[PDB]
Enzyme design. Structure first.
Site, PDB file in Angstrom:
ATOM      1  N   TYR A  28       0.838  -1.199   0.000  1.00 18.71           N
ATOM      2  CA  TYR A  28       0.000   0.000   0.000  1.00 18.71           C
ATOM      3  C   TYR A  28       0.875   1.252   0.000  1.00 18.71           C
ATOM      4  CZ  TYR A  28      -4.332  -2.529   0.644  1.00 18.71           C
ATOM      5  OH  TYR A  28      -5.415  -3.351   0.445  1.00 18.71           O
ATOM      6  N   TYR A  71     -14.918   6.045   4.080  1.00 15.57           N
ATOM      7  CA  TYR A  71     -14.554   5.025   3.109  1.00 15.57           C
ATOM      8  C   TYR A  71     -13.707   3.983   3.824  1.00 15.57           C
ATOM      9  CZ  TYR A  71     -12.695   2.834  -1.127  1.00 15.57           C
ATOM     10  OH  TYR A  71     -12.357   1.940  -2.128  1.00 15.57           O
ATOM     11  N   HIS A 109     -15.491  -0.542  -1.675  1.00 11.20           N
ATOM     12  CA  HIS A 109     -15.578  -1.322  -2.903  1.00 11.20           C
ATOM     13  C   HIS A 109     -15.256  -2.777  -2.600  1.00 11.20           C
ATOM     14  CE1 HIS A 109     -14.828   2.795  -4.494  1.00 11.20           C
ATOM     15  NE2 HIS A 109     -15.676   2.409  -5.433  1.00 11.20           N
ATOM     16  N   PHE A 120     -20.636 -10.777   4.252  1.00 12.88           N
ATOM     17  CA  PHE A 120     -20.209 -10.251   5.544  1.00 12.88           C
ATOM     18  C   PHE A 120     -20.760  -8.843   5.781  1.00 12.88           C
ATOM     19  CE2 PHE A 120     -17.099  -7.909   8.167  1.00 12.88           C
ATOM     20  CZ  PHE A 120     -17.130  -8.658   9.318  1.00 12.88           C
ATOM     21  N   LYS A 123     -24.532  -8.321   6.515  1.00 17.17           N
ATOM     22  CA  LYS A 123     -24.930  -8.632   7.884  1.00 17.17           C
ATOM     23  C   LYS A 123     -24.942  -7.393   8.769  1.00 17.17           C
ATOM     24  CE  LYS A 123     -23.001 -12.233   9.740  1.00 17.17           C
ATOM     25  NZ  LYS A 123     -22.183 -13.434  10.080  1.00 17.17           N
TER      26      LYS A 123
HETATM   27  C1  ACO Z   1     -12.333  -3.480   1.067  1.00 14.76           C
HETATM   28  C2  ACO Z   1     -12.748  -4.482   2.108  1.00 14.76           C
HETATM   29  O1  ACO Z   1     -12.731  -4.209   3.286  1.00 14.76           O
HETATM   30  S1  ACO Z   1     -13.225  -6.127   1.562  1.00 14.76           S
HETATM   31  C3  ACO Z   1     -12.836  -7.034   3.125  1.00 14.76           C
HETATM   32  C4  ACO Z   1     -12.511  -8.497   2.821  1.00 14.76           C
HETATM   33  N1  ACO Z   1     -11.305  -8.905   3.575  1.00 14.76           N
HETATM   34  C5  ACO Z   1     -10.946 -10.259   3.559  1.00 14.76           C
HETATM   35  O2  ACO Z   1     -11.632 -11.058   2.935  1.00 14.76           O
HETATM   36  C6  ACO Z   1      -9.704 -10.620   4.342  1.00 14.76           C
HETATM   37  C7  ACO Z   1      -9.796 -12.118   4.786  1.00 14.76           C
HETATM   38  N2  ACO Z   1     -10.799 -12.304   5.860  1.00 14.76           N
HETATM   39  C8  ACO Z   1     -10.683 -11.602   7.066  1.00 14.76           C
HETATM   40  O3  ACO Z   1      -9.749 -10.832   7.255  1.00 14.76           O
HETATM   41  C9  ACO Z   1     -11.754 -11.838   8.140  1.00 14.76           C
HETATM   42  O4  ACO Z   1     -12.178 -13.156   8.019  1.00 14.76           O
HETATM   43  C10 ACO Z   1     -12.897 -10.796   8.010  1.00 14.76           C
HETATM   44  C11 ACO Z   1     -12.381  -9.368   8.159  1.00 14.76           C
HETATM   45  C12 ACO Z   1     -13.653 -10.948   6.697  1.00 14.76           C
HETATM   46  C13 ACO Z   1     -13.850 -11.094   9.186  1.00 14.76           C
HETATM   47  O5  ACO Z   1     -13.097 -10.983  10.316  1.00 14.76           O
HETATM   48  P1  ACO Z   1     -13.603 -12.263  11.370  1.00 14.76           P
HETATM   49  O6  ACO Z   1     -13.000 -11.859  12.647  1.00 14.76           O
HETATM   50  O7  ACO Z   1     -13.131 -13.489  10.628  1.00 14.76           O
HETATM   51  O8  ACO Z   1     -15.205 -12.057  11.280  1.00 14.76           O
HETATM   52  P2  ACO Z   1     -16.163 -12.374  12.638  1.00 14.76           P
HETATM   53  O9  ACO Z   1     -15.567 -13.560  13.291  1.00 14.76           O
HETATM   54  O10 ACO Z   1     -16.306 -11.084  13.416  1.00 14.76           O
HETATM   55  O11 ACO Z   1     -17.624 -12.776  12.061  1.00 14.76           O
HETATM   56  C14 ACO Z   1     -17.418 -13.922  11.294  1.00 14.76           C
HETATM   57  C15 ACO Z   1     -17.976 -13.650   9.925  1.00 14.76           C
HETATM   58  O12 ACO Z   1     -16.897 -13.441   9.066  1.00 14.76           O
HETATM   59  C16 ACO Z   1     -17.309 -13.818   7.773  1.00 14.76           C
HETATM   60  N3  ACO Z   1     -16.095 -14.355   7.147  1.00 14.76           N
HETATM   61  C17 ACO Z   1     -15.585 -14.076   5.869  1.00 14.76           C
HETATM   62  N4  ACO Z   1     -14.425 -14.730   5.616  1.00 14.76           N
HETATM   63  C18 ACO Z   1     -14.181 -15.457   6.802  1.00 14.76           C
HETATM   64  C19 ACO Z   1     -13.137 -16.341   7.185  1.00 14.76           C
HETATM   65  N5  ACO Z   1     -12.105 -16.616   6.315  1.00 14.76           N
HETATM   66  N6  ACO Z   1     -13.128 -16.939   8.428  1.00 14.76           N
HETATM   67  C20 ACO Z   1     -14.194 -16.613   9.244  1.00 14.76           C
HETATM   68  N7  ACO Z   1     -15.248 -15.805   9.032  1.00 14.76           N
HETATM   69  C21 ACO Z   1     -15.215 -15.225   7.768  1.00 14.76           C
HETATM   70  C22 ACO Z   1     -18.408 -14.921   7.864  1.00 14.76           C
HETATM   71  O13 ACO Z   1     -19.529 -14.566   7.127  1.00 14.76           O
HETATM   72  C23 ACO Z   1     -18.735 -14.887   9.410  1.00 14.76           C
HETATM   73  O14 ACO Z   1     -20.048 -14.704   9.601  1.00 14.76           O
HETATM   74  P3  ACO Z   1     -20.838 -16.256  10.198  1.00 14.76           P
HETATM   75  O15 ACO Z   1     -19.738 -16.964  10.973  1.00 14.76           O
HETATM   76  O16 ACO Z   1     -21.987 -15.625  10.949  1.00 14.76           O
HETATM   77  O17 ACO Z   1     -21.167 -16.762   8.820  1.00 14.76           O
END
Ligand code: ACO
Length: 151
Positions: A28, A71, A109, A120, A123
Site C-alpha cells: 500500500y 470510506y 468497494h 459479511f 450482515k
Molecule cells: C475493502 C474491504 O474491506 S473487503 C474485506 C474483505 N477482507 C478479507 O476477505 C480478508 C480475509 N478475511 C478476514 O480478514 C476476516 O475473516 C474478516 C475481516 C472478513 C472477518 O473478520 P472475522 O473476525 O473473521 O469475522 P467475525 O468472526 O467477526 O464474524 C465472522 C464472519 O466473518 C465472515 N467471514 C468471511 N471470511 C471469513 C473467514 N475466512 N473466516 C471466518 N469468518 C469469515 C463470515 O460470514 C462470518 O459470519 P458467520 O460466521 O456468521 O457466517
C-alpha cells in the site's frame, strides 16, 4: 469477544504494514497510511490474546453537499484469529463512530466475485448501491460493487 483497540500513529504504524503485507496482495502506498492515520477513531488496530491480530483503516471524505462520509480502505484479521468476532468488533466500532461523529454514509468497494465479503457486510446493514467495472481496487482493474450504509 474481548478485543482491545488502539489508534494508529507513527509509533505503531509498522504493525499495520505487517498485517497488510500478509493480508493483501501488494504494497500500500504512503497516502493510504497518511489517510488512515488522519481518519482518527475510524482507523484501529485490534489486539487479542496479547497480540496485534487485525485492523480496520478508513479514509474520511467531504461531499459537495457539506456532508461527510467514511470510506473503508481495508478490514482484515489474521487467519489464526478469524471467526471469533474480531472483525465484527472492528466494524461495529467504526459504525458506532459513524453515528457519534454524524457521518452521513459509509462505503467501500468489493470485487464482484468476493461473495464472502458481500455476505459479511450485508450482515451489518450494508447494501450494494452501484456496480463499477474495471475499478482499481488494488493495482489491477476489477469489477466492483459499491457497498454502502446510510445514516
Ligand atoms: C475493502 C474491504 O474491506 S473487503 C474485506 C474483505 N477482507 C478479507 O476477505 C480478508 C480475509 N478475511 C478476514 O480478514 C476476516 O475473516 C474478516 C475481516 C472478513 C472477518 O473478520 P472475522 O473476525 O473473521 O469475522 P467475525 O468472526 O467477526 O464474524 C465472522 C464472519 O466473518 C465472515 N467471514 C468471511 N471470511 C471469513 C473467514 N475466512 N473466516 C471466518 N469468518 C469469515 C463470515 O460470514 C462470518 O459470519 P458467520 O460466521 O456468521 O457466517
Amino acid at each position: 469477544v474481548s478485543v482491545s483497540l488502539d489508534g494508529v500513529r507513527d509509533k505503531n504504524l509498522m504493525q499495520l504494514k505487517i498485517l497488510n503485507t500478509v493480508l493483501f496482495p501488494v504494497r500500500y502506498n504512503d497516502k493510504y497510511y497518511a489517510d488512515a492515520i488522519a481518519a482518527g477513531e475510524f482507523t484501529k488496530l485490534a489486539y487479542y490474546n496479547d497480540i496485534c491480530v487485525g485492523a480496520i483503516a478508513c479514509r474520511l471524505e467531504k461531499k459537495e453537499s457539506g456532508a461527510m462520509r467514511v470510506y473503508i480502505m481495508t478490514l482484515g484479521v489474521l487467519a489464526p484469529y478469524r471467526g471469533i468476532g474480531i472483525g465484527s468488533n472492528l466494524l461495529n466500532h467504526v459504525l458506532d463512530m459513524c453515528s457519534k461523529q454524524n457521518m452521513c454514509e459509509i462505503y467501500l468497494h468489493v470485487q464482484t466475485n468476493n461473495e464472502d465479503a458481500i455476505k459479511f457486510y450485508k450482515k451489518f446493514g450494508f447494501e450494494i448501491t452501484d456496480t463499477i467495472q474495471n475499478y482499481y481496487i488494488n493495482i489491477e482493474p476489477r469489477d466492483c460493487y459499491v457497498v454502502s450504509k446510510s445514516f
